[PDB]
Design a protein around this ligand. Sequence first.
Ligand SMILES: Nc1ncnc2c1ncn2[C@@H]1O[C@H](COP(=O)(O)O)[C@@H](O)[C@H]1O
Ligand SMILES: Nc1ncnc2c1ncn2[C@@H]1O[C@H](COP(=O)(O)O)[C@@H](O)[C@H]1O
Ligand code: FES
Ligand code: FES
Ligand SMILES: [Zn+2]
Ligand SMILES: [Zn+2]
Ligand SMILES: [Zn+2]
Ligand SMILES: [Zn+2]
Lengths: 308, 302
Amino acid sequence: SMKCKFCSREAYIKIHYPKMYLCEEHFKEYFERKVSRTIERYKLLTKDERILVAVSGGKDSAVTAYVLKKLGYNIECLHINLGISGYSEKSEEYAKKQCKLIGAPLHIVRIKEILGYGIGEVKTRRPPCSYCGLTKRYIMNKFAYDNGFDAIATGHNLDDEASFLLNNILHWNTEYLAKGGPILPQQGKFIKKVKPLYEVTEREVVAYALAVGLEYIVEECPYARGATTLDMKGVLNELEEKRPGTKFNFVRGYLKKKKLFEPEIKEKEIKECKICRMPSSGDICAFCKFWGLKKEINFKVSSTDEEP
Amino acid sequence: SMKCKFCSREAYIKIHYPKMYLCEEHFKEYFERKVSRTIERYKLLTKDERILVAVSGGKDSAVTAYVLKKLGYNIECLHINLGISGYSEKSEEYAKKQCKLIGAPLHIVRIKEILGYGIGEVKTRRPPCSYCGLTKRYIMNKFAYDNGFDAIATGHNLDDEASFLLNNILHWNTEYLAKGGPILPQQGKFIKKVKPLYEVTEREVVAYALAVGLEYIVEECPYGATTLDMKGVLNELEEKRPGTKFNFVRGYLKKKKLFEPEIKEKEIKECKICRMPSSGDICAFCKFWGLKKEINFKVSST
Ligand SMILES: Nc1ncnc2c1ncn2[C@@H]1O[C@H](COP(=O)(O)O)[C@@H](O)[C@H]1O
Ligand SMILES: Nc1ncnc2c1ncn2[C@@H]1O[C@H](COP(=O)(O)O)[C@@H](O)[C@H]1O
Ligand code: FES
Ligand code: FES
Ligand SMILES: [Zn+2]
Ligand SMILES: [Zn+2]
Ligand SMILES: [Zn+2]
Ligand SMILES: [Zn+2]
């Protein structure tokens, strides 16, 4: 077995791009520095901002919160319990454990308490994974807005971006290809969304979580029909194995040529929801229409979990 | 084993896009019709045109020539012997066999006779496979031009296009992405280049060549497997979701226009030596081969 390129310790991991062997400690430092560089590169965050980390219970958002906290950022965390019996309880417990170890405040929103129904419970023909993303994205935006947070940070890694690009390139979804990247800058009541793990691989995320002692959910959604992302991920991993830096250069190259997909948006119709005043297309937004809401949900909090 | 969707014969192949089982005869008919449809779709060729099929000795160009001949087109074939000792002789023999079975006239150009050196004999740091596509593309263009051919047809299949797109999307080669598709329309001394096999898979090409009795070289140059890596990956994707390769290529044709502003167009000049399209005084071909005079490919086919 090879040793660390920086110290006299057994190598914990081998980085393929650039090729090197690092120990448990020099990898942690490498990872943290690589995330720090991503935040500097695309001017993601400042240390004065109040950051809201959307924590799922999985590795990605747990490591996002951990690294940002270690780098000395002003973070708070949000976990959305989608009320899936036999999945949401374990995921909520995992998020609690993570935020406890990280030492960051955790806010929990239970959709079965707010909207009455959990995900998969509503009388719908549409799959539960479709209105899932709509429910999470809205709740994390309105929570951040209602509580005056400057930015939202998600767990999306290099593999997530590479697979999203590959999938939309294959389908020629030029509108989705124009809206990618590490920053979704603040547009009205839409809080700034950032991806600090944009240039780190899922493999590096797994190794970092194991090293710092972060326990997480690997379990995918039980309501899922098809493994499209896993198919794209496996394919890009095969390509990466032969040519290291494939994922990186594909994503970085895309940022240089994203401008070409920009004339595809052509959208200029902006409205405010009659129920919650959040950005809408028409009288009522997709969220209030789907959940059959007559009144606005206020996510503004004073007394957070274990606080007065 | 399933039977043919059209007759009482054992199925030879299972087409996945669109899903159906066909026999040796109904597959031949389907393949031929699918190629006919490609020629109609992008207005590739007319039956009055004199077509030059660039035959390598491999399956693709052999099937291109065969199908065009069967569909009733005016074809002639060109084989370029790159003088690679232990490769070029077998490839020339394979092309002869193919054109004999097809029943199409075959013209042979030996680069070791014309340029003095074979590909891999010239004192160069760069690999031969780089100045190979340069030598082939030039010779097949000047041959077609010198002999008054209306179009050049190559063996490029759906897999070749899908892998080229995937490779240039991964590298974000937006200039190469603007110049793709089934037609390279005639621009001056550059003859119209077409891809009749644009919508047929390599798997369908292998099955067609075996059915009609075409023998070929399973082309692996003696001088990296980037294309095979892209092909294997797209085959994996196709196995899970059929029609991936087709929708990727067809979708690309709808959005090719987006890569067009990445033109970066330079002044169009004529070569001081051979008058063929050039960037500067002398073209890349005459510069590399150190040519002082023009090569005339004009032939009197008795
Ligand atoms: N239940 C959840 N509660 C809070 N944040 C979540 C939840 N599910 C996902 N997220 C966040 O959303 C990001 C993308 O999630 P996904 O669409 O499941 O890949 C994750 O990396 C997390 O930052
Ligand atoms: N030696 C050759 N002589 C004539 N045509 C060729 C030759 N090599 C390749 N071609 C043609 O050019 C196409 C693309 O070239 P390649 O990518 O090298 O296979 C082939 O499918 C053939 O139709
Ligand atoms: S229901 Fe949320 S991802 Fe499946
Ligand atoms: S030298 Fe022509 S393909 Fe290798
Ligand atoms: Zn070390
Ligand atoms: Zn609303
Ligand atoms: Zn049949
Ligand atoms: Zn010249």
